[PDB]
Symmetry: C2
């Protein structure tokens, strides 16, 4: 019964028995594609193009109320009923709990993982994103650099928190988890796409560098970083 | 493990070591947790972490709360009866809901909708309303270039619209009062009261947000939690 969800009018399901992903390769979108690749859950990816204002369409918003990617529609949700969901961090937790992977069953570790996920969702994403605005997008042209410097300094502070935490450790929690999947695409985005490597003094965070490199070596990460592409759009036009 | 193993307790000793320890300040994020504790009826001992004194930047505080922020907790009666340290208001809300079996629906689909709205709060409402505070109420108000202010004001208006349209015909964010309401409404109150941003964000227009906020503020646990720690 996916036809009850208007999003499917705009991105029809070729495989309605599979989880539907509505996304774009961005630091938030790739959290979810990476997660799906890691856990081996079948899914059907759909490209939501910002160039066409797709994320502002009534069909998209009918599921993803905040007009943002990523969003999912899982036909095999609780009770075998479809589950609509947005917010990358909520989707990560949902998928971890659904699959039993990448979120510890040990309660204390569960909560430590959720803590670091929330740190990402409130700190890393929002603050690194402002560095992008003030160094890579329109804000880069603003002559008054006090705003830029606010967000750069805060991003450096957050990197320091990560760096100190990761000393002596492989991952944020005792096992690789959704907290890593949430954080490291954003670290990558800051130092690659936003061209902010020197601005945030990245070379001083040796532990973050080490763990980022380990993250990027993972085959599921390399796949998930690239998904969705456009091929799922072509037959429809 | 015993509570003295956590260096935070050197600076804020536990007078009641059998009780959950809260390290907080009356702020939109701190009151999420004090409100939650009041709602669920769990005993706790609150400690004031003074921003005026840079307490949140002390080594003792940071030893538990690694991001140097309030709120944080240390629950002696954590899972398996072992002490559990935790920071991030949204994580603490999930923890307390799961510990108490309150304020998350038994319907897992409703639980996930609730967690969605909690993440919307944690990534959108808190960070963006907080920037309106900086650029309207605190020192960023002095900046002659208003493009940053307007960026955050416009985004805050957009977020309020999302809430407002969602709340039409509803009492709460999910079908029952939940941790998502507790996360969101203290921030709405902060924006319009503390930051004096009521005209700035055109708050008058969000009739559903106003209605639900008013209901929220009538709850006794909310009134009590707003003032803790004193
Ligand atoms: N909390 C949400 C954030 C989702 C999100 O930001 N999605 C972006 C693409 S990810 S790309 C990263 C994203 N940037 C943007 O969205 C750029 C556009 C924005 N309106 C602006 O002016 O900065 C960002 O900084 N995010 C901060 C964070 O993660 O907390 C989107 O759909 N934008 C469409 C739109 O805005 O119309 C989540 O985790 O899912
Ligand atoms: N994600 C964390 C956020 C916690 C948080 O922001 N705590 C504040 C007090 S709540 S008061 C609201 C808070 N403001 C501030 O923290 C003001 C100081 C800041 N450094 C600045 O320059 O703006 C804010 O805007 N928060 C955004 C959000 O909730 O996402 C704190 O301890 N600050 C100490 C410090 O910065 O040294 C959570 O949910 O627990």
């Amino acid at each position: 019964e996916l036809s009850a969800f208007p999003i499917t009018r705009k991105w029809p399901a070729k495989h309605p028995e599979r989880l539907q992903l509505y996304s774009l390769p961005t630091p938030n979108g790739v959290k979810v594609s990476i997660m799906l690749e890691e856990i081996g859950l079948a899914y059907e990816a759909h490209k939501v193009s910002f160039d066409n204002d797709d994320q502002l369409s009534p069909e998209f918003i009918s599921l993803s109320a905040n007009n943002k990617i990523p969003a999912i529609l899982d036909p095999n949700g609780p009770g075998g009923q479809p589950l609509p969901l947005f917010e990358s961090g909520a989707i990560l937790q949902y998928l971890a709990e659904k699959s039993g992977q990448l979120l510890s069953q040990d309660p204390a570790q569960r909560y430590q993982t959720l803590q670091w996920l929330m740190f990402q969702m409130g700190g890393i994403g929002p603050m690194f994103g402002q560095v992008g605005f003030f160094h890579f997008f329109a804000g880069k042209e603003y002559e008054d650099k006090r705003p830029r410097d606010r967000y750069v300094n805060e991003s450096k502070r957050l990197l320091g928190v990560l760096d100190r935490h990761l000393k002596g450790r492989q991952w944020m929690a005792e096992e690789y988890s959704i907290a890593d999947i949430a954080i490291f695409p954003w670290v990558r985005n800051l130092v690659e796409r936003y061209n902010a490597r020197d601005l945030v003094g990245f070379d001083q965070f040796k532990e973050v560098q080490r763990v980022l490199a380990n993250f990027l070596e993972r085959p599921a990460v390399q796949h998930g970083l690239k998904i969705p592409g456009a091929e799922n759009l072509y037959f429809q036009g």
